[PDB]
Amino acid sequence: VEVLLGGDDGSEAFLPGDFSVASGEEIVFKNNAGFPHNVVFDEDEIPSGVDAAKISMSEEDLLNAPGETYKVTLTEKGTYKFYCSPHQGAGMVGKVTVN
Numbered sequence: 001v002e003v004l005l006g007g008d009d010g011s012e013a014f015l016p017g018d019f020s021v022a023s024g025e026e027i028v029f030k031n032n033a034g035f036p037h038n039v040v041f042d043e044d045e046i047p048s049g050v051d052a053a054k055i056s057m058s059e060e061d062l063l064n065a066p067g068e069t070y071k072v073t074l075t076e077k078g079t080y081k082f083y084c085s086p087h088q089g090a091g092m093v094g095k096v097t098v099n
């Protein structure tokens with residue numbers, strides 16, 4: 001699945017923002033507009049025994065040009081909440097359910 005970081009209008013949302021993937025399916029986050037964006041997984045809201053450091057972007061690495069990607073694959077089944085650091089306050093949060 002591909003997930004846009006920002007709507008074209010600069011809306012601060014993941015698109016889609018609440019989706020499902022199979023274990024092992026690649027998630028392609030694509031910088032869209034309204035950047036800077038990144039993707040961090042909330043360690044309190046992901047399945048037990050998943051290291052959030054392995055699936056989150058590096059803290060200082062922000063996507064700042066259109067089309068730039070961050071690719072990640074989740075395996076442990078469950079729900080995962082993730083967010084954009086800069087726009088967390090503004091409601092740029094998402095949810096993926098791995099099945």
Ligand SMILES: [Cu+2]
Nearest residue numbers: 036037084087
């Ligand atoms: Cu953002």
